[PDB]
């Protein structure tokens, strides 16, 4: 897991930029899927174009050899795509290139073999049909979950990247649907809205963190992932966002102690759609999107730039997800603390093998 600290730093850098853009929107993105997509893209780039990409993913190229970078990503892809995965994690990256380009066979091999991704040739001279084929690929890859992803291409487009991911996890210790009820969600300190709220009395990996001024809940999925929910104390959301570090996360993941709690957690159906050109440009990745791009590993003779790059992540949290593991947790008599995720909170999903940050986000209003 040599690249996990870099991915964690990329997650935070990406998160802190989005939360600065808008402070009143649900955030949800996949640090892993975005970083995978552009590490794969870097294989077709050279010189500064290449270096800007890996540095933008929080890799110090003076310290970590590039072979270890791509080895880390491909080992991460090996665990996420096990055929016997209960993770129910659907992700894909599509490269759409102008059919008039002479593509380097080495790049297409690396994309399909090393990164298990997809590359398509399209006639960008028909800009509305190229857009349809891009949206059809995402809709077919998500079996109808993500529809009409790309809303507009510009006529000069010759190279587009789409990165999607959809997660519906199954809780190892599930909630009962009968106990889900409508509850208040404090969008601010004087305002509430009603949302469907799951609840369960059980033995939770849960603690209050002085450092973060937050409650910290860890719940395991069926499969190889854990969800971490951060509930900030009153007026402490910005403090929580500032203080998150990879080492603080690791200590939480090492704790296996359990205490009783009456947990209230909203059902969630949230999506995030991001312009990676704009977003990753703020993180230093710009030349690959500019006329000066060195994409000579993709095509040798003709000029090329990445004209379009979109990321869409979809999350569903509910009670269960297809029956009968039958865990019995023993609940002590004492009064269990009431931990209600009924105000803005942050969350992070972690791949259990690599400790990689599969997702990160913030819920400011479950029914936005």
mmCIF file of C-alpha atoms in Angstrom:
data_model
loop_
_atom_site.group_PDB
_atom_site.id
_atom_site.type_symbol
_atom_site.label_atom_id
_atom_site.label_comp_id
_atom_site.label_asym_id
_atom_site.label_seq_id
_atom_site.Cartn_x
_atom_site.Cartn_y
_atom_site.Cartn_z
ATOM 1 C CA UNK A 1 0.000 0.000 0.000
ATOM 2 C CA UNK A 2 2.793 2.397 -0.943
ATOM 3 C CA UNK A 3 0.490 4.858 -2.748
ATOM 4 C CA UNK A 4 -2.255 4.954 -0.091
ATOM 5 C CA UNK A 5 -0.830 8.042 1.713
ATOM 6 C CA UNK A 6 -0.755 9.871 -1.630
ATOM 7 C CA UNK A 7 -4.344 8.901 -2.450
ATOM 8 C CA UNK A 8 -5.447 10.045 1.013
ATOM 9 C CA UNK A 9 -3.700 13.383 0.475
ATOM 10 C CA UNK A 10 -5.306 13.637 -2.970
ATOM 11 C CA UNK A 11 -8.722 12.959 -1.404
ATOM 12 C CA UNK A 12 -8.317 15.790 1.109
ATOM 13 C CA UNK A 13 -6.867 18.230 -1.430
ATOM 14 C CA UNK A 14 -9.763 17.468 -3.763
ATOM 15 C CA UNK A 15 -12.321 17.683 -0.951
ATOM 16 C CA UNK A 16 -11.026 20.955 0.470
ATOM 17 C CA UNK A 17 -11.305 22.565 -2.932
ATOM 18 C CA UNK A 18 -14.890 21.446 -3.585
ATOM 19 C CA UNK A 19 -16.028 22.470 -0.103
ATOM 20 C CA UNK A 20 -14.487 25.889 -0.779
ATOM 21 C CA UNK A 21 -16.310 26.212 -4.117
ATOM 22 C CA UNK A 22 -19.755 25.668 -2.563
ATOM 23 C CA UNK A 23 -20.649 25.379 1.120
ATOM 24 C CA UNK A 24 -24.329 24.424 0.640
ATOM 25 C CA UNK A 25 -24.182 21.408 -1.691
ATOM 26 C CA UNK A 26 -23.917 17.685 -1.041
ATOM 27 C CA UNK A 27 -20.421 16.550 -2.069
ATOM 28 C CA UNK A 28 -19.588 13.021 -3.192
ATOM 29 C CA UNK A 29 -16.659 11.892 -5.335
ATOM 30 C CA UNK A 30 -14.268 8.969 -5.750
ATOM 31 C CA UNK A 31 -10.633 9.922 -5.071
ATOM 32 C CA UNK A 32 -9.573 6.457 -6.225
ATOM 33 C CA UNK A 33 -11.444 6.425 -9.536
ATOM 34 C CA UNK A 34 -10.323 9.931 -10.506
ATOM 35 C CA UNK A 35 -6.686 9.246 -9.583
ATOM 36 C CA UNK A 36 -6.733 5.897 -11.406
ATOM 37 C CA UNK A 37 -8.103 7.540 -14.536
ATOM 38 C CA UNK A 38 -5.377 10.180 -14.701
ATOM 39 C CA UNK A 39 -2.555 7.847 -13.705
ATOM 40 C CA UNK A 40 -3.697 5.773 -16.684
ATOM 41 C CA UNK A 41 -3.844 8.907 -18.843
ATOM 42 C CA UNK A 42 -0.292 9.834 -17.831
ATOM 43 C CA UNK A 43 0.975 6.713 -19.614
ATOM 44 C CA UNK A 44 0.195 8.524 -22.885
ATOM 45 C CA UNK A 45 1.851 11.832 -21.931
ATOM 46 C CA UNK A 46 5.464 12.963 -21.565
ATOM 47 C CA UNK A 47 7.642 15.622 -19.905
ATOM 48 C CA UNK A 48 5.844 18.406 -18.007
ATOM 49 C CA UNK A 49 2.382 17.353 -19.178
ATOM 50 C CA UNK A 50 3.101 14.007 -17.561
ATOM 51 C CA UNK A 51 4.709 15.418 -14.413
ATOM 52 C CA UNK A 52 1.870 17.894 -13.795
ATOM 53 C CA UNK A 53 -0.566 14.960 -13.709
ATOM 54 C CA UNK A 54 1.251 12.776 -11.189
ATOM 55 C CA UNK A 55 2.173 15.788 -9.048
ATOM 56 C CA UNK A 56 -1.480 16.860 -9.164
ATOM 57 C CA UNK A 57 -2.348 13.443 -7.696
ATOM 58 C CA UNK A 58 -0.027 14.226 -4.739
ATOM 59 C CA UNK A 59 2.929 12.106 -5.918
ATOM 60 C CA UNK A 60 6.338 13.663 -5.244
ATOM 61 C CA UNK A 61 8.189 12.452 -8.340
ATOM 62 C CA UNK A 62 11.526 13.163 -6.635
ATOM 63 C CA UNK A 63 10.697 10.562 -3.957
ATOM 64 C CA UNK A 64 8.557 7.722 -5.362
ATOM 65 C CA UNK A 65 9.524 5.943 -8.614
ATOM 66 C CA UNK A 66 6.867 5.904 -11.308
ATOM 67 C CA UNK A 67 6.943 2.099 -11.485
ATOM 68 C CA UNK A 68 5.702 1.988 -7.884
ATOM 69 C CA UNK A 69 2.941 4.468 -8.748
ATOM 70 C CA UNK A 70 1.443 2.344 -11.525
ATOM 71 C CA UNK A 71 2.043 -0.877 -9.587
ATOM 72 C CA UNK A 72 0.043 0.543 -6.690
ATOM 73 C CA UNK A 73 -2.877 1.500 -8.926
ATOM 74 C CA UNK A 74 -3.016 -1.873 -10.675
ATOM 75 C CA UNK A 75 -2.870 -3.764 -7.383
ATOM 76 C CA UNK A 76 -5.748 -1.541 -6.244
ATOM 77 C CA UNK A 77 -7.678 -2.454 -9.399
ATOM 78 C CA UNK A 78 -6.971 -6.132 -8.666
ATOM 79 C CA UNK A 79 -8.807 -5.940 -5.329
ATOM 80 C CA UNK A 80 -11.751 -3.821 -6.539
ATOM 81 C CA UNK A 81 -12.535 -6.160 -9.430
ATOM 82 C CA UNK A 82 -12.472 -9.562 -7.733
ATOM 83 C CA UNK A 83 -15.253 -11.667 -9.339
ATOM 84 C CA UNK A 84 -16.355 -12.793 -5.852
ATOM 85 C CA UNK A 85 -16.869 -9.237 -4.557
ATOM 86 C CA UNK A 86 -19.908 -8.426 -2.432
ATOM 87 C CA UNK A 87 -18.866 -4.782 -2.698
ATOM 88 C CA UNK A 88 -21.430 -4.018 -5.451
ATOM 89 C CA UNK A 89 -19.086 -1.345 -6.773
ATOM 90 C CA UNK A 90 -19.531 -0.325 -10.407
ATOM 91 C CA UNK A 91 -16.911 1.923 -11.970
ATOM 92 C CA UNK A 92 -15.554 2.652 -15.415
ATOM 93 C CA UNK A 93 -13.394 5.006 -17.423
ATOM 94 C CA UNK A 94 -14.028 5.690 -21.090
ATOM 95 C CA UNK A 95 -11.587 7.358 -23.487
ATOM 96 C CA UNK A 96 -13.275 8.804 -26.583
ATOM 97 C CA UNK A 97 -10.787 9.735 -29.315
ATOM 98 C CA UNK A 98 -11.300 11.135 -32.809
ATOM 99 C CA UNK A 99 -11.392 8.351 -35.400
ATOM 100 C CA UNK A 100 -9.069 10.366 -37.664
ATOM 101 C CA UNK A 101 -6.123 9.949 -35.279
ATOM 102 C CA UNK A 102 -3.436 7.290 -35.616
ATOM 103 C CA UNK A 103 -3.284 5.846 -32.103
ATOM 104 C CA UNK A 104 -0.135 4.363 -30.591
ATOM 105 C CA UNK A 105 -0.734 0.658 -29.993
ATOM 106 C CA UNK A 106 1.302 0.756 -26.770
ATOM 107 C CA UNK A 107 -1.118 3.217 -25.148
ATOM 108 C CA UNK A 108 -4.226 1.246 -26.129
ATOM 109 C CA UNK A 109 -2.564 -1.889 -24.741
ATOM 110 C CA UNK A 110 -1.686 -0.203 -21.441
ATOM 111 C CA UNK A 111 -5.225 1.179 -21.107
ATOM 112 C CA UNK A 112 -6.924 -2.176 -21.686
ATOM 113 C CA UNK A 113 -4.373 -4.581 -20.191
ATOM 114 C CA UNK A 114 -2.708 -2.661 -17.357
ATOM 115 C CA UNK A 115 -5.653 -0.482 -16.283
ATOM 116 C CA UNK A 116 -8.568 -2.589 -17.611
ATOM 117 C CA UNK A 117 -10.209 0.513 -19.081
ATOM 118 C CA UNK A 118 -11.983 1.288 -22.356
ATOM 119 C CA UNK A 119 -10.973 3.341 -25.394
ATOM 120 C CA UNK A 120 -13.343 4.253 -28.223
ATOM 121 C CA UNK A 121 -12.940 5.929 -31.606
ATOM 122 C CA UNK A 122 -15.728 8.388 -32.415
ATOM 123 C CA UNK A 123 -16.520 10.854 -35.204
ATOM 124 C CA UNK A 124 -16.382 14.174 -33.380
ATOM 125 C CA UNK A 125 -17.367 15.887 -36.644
ATOM 126 C CA UNK A 126 -20.907 14.989 -35.608
ATOM 127 C CA UNK A 127 -20.939 16.663 -32.241
ATOM 128 C CA UNK A 128 -24.487 15.647 -31.184
ATOM 129 C CA UNK A 129 -23.920 12.002 -32.084
ATOM 130 C CA UNK A 130 -20.555 11.865 -30.312
ATOM 131 C CA UNK A 131 -22.375 13.210 -27.249
ATOM 132 C CA UNK A 132 -25.061 10.523 -27.561
ATOM 133 C CA UNK A 133 -22.504 7.712 -27.774
ATOM 134 C CA UNK A 134 -20.699 9.105 -24.723
ATOM 135 C CA UNK A 135 -23.925 9.189 -22.691
ATOM 136 C CA UNK A 136 -25.005 5.760 -23.961
ATOM 137 C CA UNK A 137 -21.703 4.252 -22.795
ATOM 138 C CA UNK A 138 -22.166 5.633 -19.277
ATOM 139 C CA UNK A 139 -25.849 4.656 -19.157
ATOM 140 C CA UNK A 140 -25.092 1.113 -20.339
ATOM 141 C CA UNK A 141 -22.174 0.824 -17.929
ATOM 142 C CA UNK A 142 -24.455 1.923 -15.056
ATOM 143 C CA UNK A 143 -27.476 -0.079 -16.398
ATOM 144 C CA UNK A 144 -29.493 3.144 -16.443
ATOM 145 C CA UNK A 145 -28.241 4.701 -13.201
ATOM 146 C CA UNK A 146 -26.301 7.561 -14.840
ATOM 147 C CA UNK A 147 -28.213 9.116 -17.746
ATOM 148 C CA UNK A 148 -27.367 12.185 -19.856
ATOM 149 C CA UNK A 149 -23.984 12.670 -18.180
ATOM 150 C CA UNK A 150 -22.317 14.956 -20.740
ATOM 151 C CA UNK A 151 -24.706 17.776 -21.636
ATOM 152 C CA UNK A 152 -22.531 19.637 -24.168
ATOM 153 C CA UNK A 153 -19.399 19.162 -26.265
ATOM 154 C CA UNK A 154 -17.624 21.931 -28.130
ATOM 155 C CA UNK A 155 -17.018 21.565 -31.856
ATOM 156 C CA UNK A 156 -13.233 21.430 -31.393
ATOM 157 C CA UNK A 157 -13.399 18.291 -29.220
ATOM 158 C CA UNK A 158 -11.060 15.479 -30.274
ATOM 159 C CA UNK A 159 -10.498 13.659 -26.956
ATOM 160 C CA UNK A 160 -12.940 13.198 -24.061
ATOM 161 C CA UNK A 161 -12.628 11.318 -20.764
ATOM 162 C CA UNK A 162 -15.591 10.084 -18.715
ATOM 163 C CA UNK A 163 -15.128 8.514 -15.279
ATOM 164 C CA UNK A 164 -18.109 7.074 -13.423
ATOM 165 C CA UNK A 165 -18.630 5.138 -10.226
ATOM 166 C CA UNK A 166 -21.746 3.837 -8.521
ATOM 167 C CA UNK A 167 -21.805 2.241 -5.066
ATOM 168 C CA UNK A 168 -24.637 0.496 -3.230
ATOM 169 C CA UNK A 169 -23.109 -1.293 -0.262
ATOM 170 C CA UNK A 170 -24.595 -3.937 1.980
ATOM 171 C CA UNK A 171 -24.110 -3.309 5.684
ATOM 172 C CA UNK A 172 -22.470 -6.183 7.534
ATOM 173 C CA UNK A 173 -24.655 -5.227 10.520
ATOM 174 C CA UNK A 174 -27.866 -3.933 8.899
ATOM 175 C CA UNK A 175 -30.739 -1.704 9.980
ATOM 176 C CA UNK A 176 -34.354 -2.876 10.083
ATOM 177 C CA UNK A 177 -36.714 -1.205 7.601
ATOM 178 C CA UNK A 178 -39.511 -1.255 10.192
ATOM 179 C CA UNK A 179 -37.455 1.112 12.383
ATOM 180 C CA UNK A 180 -36.925 3.720 9.645
ATOM 181 C CA UNK A 181 -38.992 6.833 10.357
ATOM 182 C CA UNK A 182 -39.170 10.475 9.343
ATOM 183 C CA UNK A 183 -36.985 12.684 11.545
ATOM 184 C CA UNK A 184 -35.727 16.251 11.645
ATOM 185 C CA UNK A 185 -32.475 17.104 9.873
ATOM 186 C CA UNK A 186 -30.957 20.360 11.134
ATOM 187 C CA UNK A 187 -29.828 22.055 7.923
ATOM 188 C CA UNK A 188 -28.778 24.913 10.215
ATOM 189 C CA UNK A 189 -29.047 25.813 13.892
ATOM 190 C CA UNK A 190 -32.625 27.162 13.591
ATOM 191 C CA UNK A 191 -34.026 25.165 10.657
ATOM 192 C CA UNK A 192 -35.098 21.559 10.177
ATOM 193 C CA UNK A 193 -36.448 19.446 7.355
ATOM 194 C CA UNK A 194 -37.954 15.947 7.590
ATOM 195 C CA UNK A 195 -35.954 13.029 6.108
ATOM 196 C CA UNK A 196 -36.225 9.242 6.292
ATOM 197 C CA UNK A 197 -33.966 8.215 9.174
ATOM 198 C CA UNK A 198 -32.712 4.701 9.895
ATOM 199 C CA UNK A 199 -32.048 3.755 13.492
ATOM 200 C CA UNK A 200 -30.667 0.796 15.417
ATOM 201 C CA UNK A 201 -29.538 -0.007 18.947
ATOM 202 C CA UNK A 202 -26.325 -1.997 18.678
ATOM 203 C CA UNK A 203 -22.631 -2.311 19.432
ATOM 204 C CA UNK A 204 -20.871 0.190 17.186
ATOM 205 C CA UNK A 205 -17.300 1.062 16.367
ATOM 206 C CA UNK A 206 -18.032 4.603 17.531
ATOM 207 C CA UNK A 207 -16.155 7.213 19.535
ATOM 208 C CA UNK A 208 -16.031 10.919 20.225
ATOM 209 C CA UNK A 209 -12.822 12.544 18.977
ATOM 210 C CA UNK A 210 -11.359 15.503 20.847
ATOM 211 C CA UNK A 211 -8.978 16.262 18.008
ATOM 212 C CA UNK A 212 -11.774 16.459 15.434
ATOM 213 C CA UNK A 213 -14.491 17.735 17.790
ATOM 214 C CA UNK A 214 -16.680 15.062 16.220
ATOM 215 C CA UNK A 215 -18.341 11.719 16.692
ATOM 216 C CA UNK A 216 -16.612 9.093 14.535
ATOM 217 C CA UNK A 217 -18.624 6.075 13.367
ATOM 218 C CA UNK A 218 -17.139 3.128 11.459
ATOM 219 C CA UNK A 219 -19.478 0.588 9.854
ATOM 220 C CA UNK A 220 -18.267 -2.323 7.742
ATOM 221 C CA UNK A 221 -19.813 -3.300 4.423
ATOM 222 C CA UNK A 222 -20.219 -6.795 3.110
ATOM 223 C CA UNK A 223 -17.067 -7.074 1.050
ATOM 224 C CA UNK A 224 -13.816 -5.169 1.443
ATOM 225 C CA UNK A 225 -14.785 -1.659 2.545
ATOM 226 C CA UNK A 226 -15.628 0.408 5.629
ATOM 227 C CA UNK A 227 -17.689 3.593 5.866
ATOM 228 C CA UNK A 228 -16.462 6.329 8.219
ATOM 229 C CA UNK A 229 -18.968 9.002 9.283
ATOM 230 C CA UNK A 230 -17.822 12.215 11.010
ATOM 231 C CA UNK A 231 -20.488 14.112 12.974
ATOM 232 C CA UNK A 232 -19.010 17.487 14.016
ATOM 233 C CA UNK A 233 -19.927 19.123 17.299
ATOM 234 C CA UNK A 234 -21.944 22.342 17.263
ATOM 235 C CA UNK A 235 -20.158 24.892 15.106
ATOM 236 C CA UNK A 236 -17.265 22.504 14.418
ATOM 237 C CA UNK A 237 -17.824 21.423 10.796
ATOM 238 C CA UNK A 238 -15.060 23.657 9.427
ATOM 239 C CA UNK A 239 -12.743 22.537 12.234
ATOM 240 C CA UNK A 240 -13.416 18.883 11.383
ATOM 241 C CA UNK A 241 -12.682 19.472 7.694
ATOM 242 C CA UNK A 242 -9.405 21.246 8.497
ATOM 243 C CA UNK A 243 -8.099 18.679 10.996
ATOM 244 C CA UNK A 244 -8.623 15.490 8.968
ATOM 245 C CA UNK A 245 -5.316 13.751 8.220
ATOM 246 C CA UNK A 246 -4.394 10.302 6.949
ATOM 247 C CA UNK A 247 -2.785 9.343 10.271
ATOM 248 C CA UNK A 248 -5.931 10.295 12.200
ATOM 249 C CA UNK A 249 -7.937 8.090 9.818
ATOM 250 C CA UNK A 250 -5.510 5.186 10.243
ATOM 251 C CA UNK A 251 -5.857 5.244 14.041
ATOM 252 C CA UNK A 252 -9.650 5.043 13.673
ATOM 253 C CA UNK A 253 -9.256 2.046 11.352
ATOM 254 C CA UNK A 254 -7.040 0.300 13.931
ATOM 255 C CA UNK A 255 -9.647 0.638 16.696
ATOM 256 C CA UNK A 256 -11.857 -2.448 16.985
ATOM 257 C CA UNK A 257 -13.478 -1.603 20.331
ATOM 258 C CA UNK A 258 -17.270 -1.471 20.359
ATOM 259 C CA UNK A 259 -19.741 0.323 22.605
ATOM 260 C CA UNK A 260 -23.496 0.574 22.757
ATOM 261 C CA UNK A 261 -25.208 3.426 20.954
ATOM 262 C CA UNK A 262 -28.658 4.316 19.636
ATOM 263 C CA UNK A 263 -27.609 5.309 16.108
ATOM 264 C CA UNK A 264 -29.763 7.466 13.845
ATOM 265 C CA UNK A 265 -28.511 7.597 10.256
ATOM 266 C CA UNK A 266 -30.357 9.009 7.225
ATOM 267 C CA UNK A 267 -31.115 7.059 4.124
ATOM 268 C CA UNK A 268 -29.132 8.689 1.319
ATOM 269 C CA UNK A 269 -29.369 8.835 -2.473
ATOM 270 C CA UNK A 270 -26.791 11.419 -3.527
ATOM 271 C CA UNK A 271 -24.771 12.048 -6.675
ATOM 272 C CA UNK A 272 -21.805 14.212 -7.519
ATOM 273 C CA UNK A 273 -20.903 15.507 -10.990
ATOM 274 C CA UNK A 274 -17.634 17.353 -11.507
ATOM 275 C CA UNK A 275 -15.782 19.030 -14.375
ATOM 276 C CA UNK A 276 -12.330 17.525 -13.923
ATOM 277 C CA UNK A 277 -10.736 20.099 -16.234
ATOM 278 C CA UNK A 278 -11.844 22.900 -13.914
ATOM 279 C CA UNK A 279 -11.332 20.994 -10.668
ATOM 280 C CA UNK A 280 -7.980 19.341 -11.394
ATOM 281 C CA UNK A 281 -6.774 22.580 -12.988
ATOM 282 C CA UNK A 282 -6.923 24.139 -9.521
ATOM 283 C CA UNK A 283 -4.731 21.252 -8.295
ATOM 284 C CA UNK A 284 -2.055 21.989 -10.912
ATOM 285 C CA UNK A 285 -3.097 19.709 -13.808
ATOM 286 C CA UNK A 286 -3.489 22.103 -16.740
ATOM 287 C CA UNK A 287 -1.176 21.345 -19.691
ATOM 288 C CA UNK A 288 -2.906 18.076 -20.589
ATOM 289 C CA UNK A 289 -6.065 20.138 -21.208
ATOM 290 C CA UNK A 290 -4.227 22.833 -23.228
ATOM 291 C CA UNK A 291 -3.048 23.132 -26.821
ATOM 292 C CA UNK A 292 0.517 22.568 -25.636
ATOM 293 C CA UNK A 293 -0.305 19.090 -24.318
ATOM 294 C CA UNK A 294 2.343 16.430 -24.897
ATOM 295 C CA UNK A 295 0.111 13.438 -25.658
ATOM 296 C CA UNK A 296 2.697 11.880 -27.993
ATOM 297 C CA UNK A 297 2.239 8.554 -26.209
ATOM 298 C CA UNK A 298 -1.352 8.568 -27.497
ATOM 299 C CA UNK A 299 -0.714 9.821 -31.042
ATOM 300 C CA UNK A 300 2.684 10.684 -32.493
ATOM 301 C CA UNK A 301 2.064 12.883 -35.534
ATOM 302 C CA UNK A 302 -1.041 14.920 -34.789
ATOM 303 C CA UNK A 303 -1.543 17.472 -32.006
ATOM 304 C CA UNK A 304 -3.923 16.455 -29.247
ATOM 305 C CA UNK A 305 -5.360 17.770 -25.997
ATOM 306 C CA UNK A 306 -7.899 16.463 -23.501
ATOM 307 C CA UNK A 307 -10.915 18.599 -24.371
ATOM 308 C CA UNK A 308 -13.442 17.144 -21.908
ATOM 309 C CA UNK A 309 -13.164 15.264 -18.616
ATOM 310 C CA UNK A 310 -16.139 14.482 -16.355
ATOM 311 C CA UNK A 311 -16.559 12.531 -13.117
ATOM 312 C CA UNK A 312 -19.898 11.324 -11.788
ATOM 313 C CA UNK A 313 -20.250 9.401 -8.527
ATOM 314 C CA UNK A 314 -23.522 7.980 -7.203
ATOM 315 C CA UNK A 315 -24.073 6.810 -3.615
ATOM 316 C CA UNK A 316 -26.980 4.929 -2.056
ATOM 317 C CA UNK A 317 -27.173 4.306 1.695
ATOM 318 C CA UNK A 318 -30.071 2.246 3.001
ATOM 319 C CA UNK A 319 -30.929 -0.407 5.573
ATOM 320 C CA UNK A 320 -29.749 -3.677 4.128
ATOM 321 C CA UNK A 321 -29.196 -4.482 0.421
ATOM 322 C CA UNK A 322 -29.925 -11.118 0.370
ATOM 323 C CA UNK A 323 -30.598 -12.226 3.928
ATOM 324 C CA UNK A 324 -29.426 -14.132 6.952
ATOM 325 C CA UNK A 325 -25.959 -13.558 8.333
ATOM 326 C CA UNK A 326 -27.666 -13.324 11.752
ATOM 327 C CA UNK A 327 -25.211 -11.451 13.966
ATOM 328 C CA UNK A 328 -26.358 -11.174 17.606
ATOM 329 C CA UNK A 329 -24.764 -8.200 19.440
ATOM 330 C CA UNK A 330 -25.034 -8.181 23.235
ATOM 331 C CA UNK A 331 -26.196 -4.806 24.531
ATOM 332 C CA UNK A 332 -25.303 -3.822 28.115
ATOM 333 C CA UNK A 333 -27.899 -2.345 30.416
ATOM 334 C CA UNK A 334 -26.402 1.122 30.756
ATOM 335 C CA UNK A 335 -27.918 4.100 28.955
ATOM 336 C CA UNK A 336 -26.576 4.079 25.384
ATOM 337 C CA UNK A 337 -25.566 7.467 23.961
ATOM 338 C CA UNK A 338 -27.889 8.821 21.291
ATOM 339 C CA UNK A 339 -25.826 9.542 18.167
ATOM 340 C CA UNK A 340 -27.963 11.221 15.493
ATOM 341 C CA UNK A 341 -26.553 12.095 12.070
ATOM 342 C CA UNK A 342 -29.230 14.775 11.762
ATOM 343 C CA UNK A 343 -27.019 17.726 10.770
ATOM 344 C CA UNK A 344 -24.281 18.282 8.153
ATOM 345 C CA UNK A 345 -21.664 15.546 8.299
ATOM 346 C CA UNK A 346 -18.633 14.258 6.390
ATOM 347 C CA UNK A 347 -17.916 10.713 5.309
ATOM 348 C CA UNK A 348 -15.205 8.538 3.799
ATOM 349 C CA UNK A 349 -15.292 4.981 2.449
ATOM 350 C CA UNK A 350 -12.089 2.957 2.801
ATOM 351 C CA UNK A 351 -11.041 -0.163 0.903
ATOM 352 C CA UNK A 352 -10.131 -2.612 3.650
ATOM 353 C CA UNK A 353 -7.109 -4.255 1.995
ATOM 354 C CA UNK A 354 -5.284 -1.141 0.764
ATOM 355 C CA UNK A 355 -6.840 1.440 3.150
ATOM 356 C CA UNK A 356 -7.496 3.471 -0.022
ATOM 357 C CA UNK A 357 -10.178 6.200 0.037
ATOM 358 C CA UNK A 358 -12.809 4.844 -2.341
ATOM 359 C CA UNK A 359 -15.155 7.794 -1.697
ATOM 360 C CA UNK A 360 -15.327 11.034 0.229
ATOM 361 C CA UNK A 361 -18.187 13.454 0.663
ATOM 362 C CA UNK A 362 -20.351 15.729 2.761
ATOM 363 C CA UNK A 363 -24.111 15.682 3.341
ATOM 364 C CA UNK A 364 -25.529 19.152 4.016
ATOM 365 C CA UNK A 365 -29.139 18.037 3.351
ATOM 366 C CA UNK A 366 -30.115 14.412 2.594
ATOM 367 C CA UNK A 367 -33.061 15.486 0.425
ATOM 368 C CA UNK A 368 -31.372 18.194 -1.657
#
